Amino acid sequence: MKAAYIIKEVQNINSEREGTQIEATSLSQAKRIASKEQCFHGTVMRIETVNGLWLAYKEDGKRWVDCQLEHHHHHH
């Protein structure tokens, strides 16, 4: 089944902008779509859920960085 993702192209890793709605059948496929859709040299592509959770992002010339998906809990 397709899932909804949001792809953002941002100037800086810790920047926020409106993204674009995509559908993809896996996170792997969403990453392929996001890299293909990059419009500007030197920006960061980020994949989020519709609820705004960071899933992964990629700077130019670097590999995808996968982000932590679970809510925090106390370890002590």
Numbering used by the authors: 1 to 76
Show me the paper's own sentences about this structure.
Prokaryotic adaptive immunity by CRISPR‐Cas systems, which confer resistance to foreign genetic elements, has been used by bacteria to combat viruses.
To understand the molecular basis underlying AcrIF9 anti‐CRISPR function, we determined the 1.2 Å crystal structure of AcrIF9.
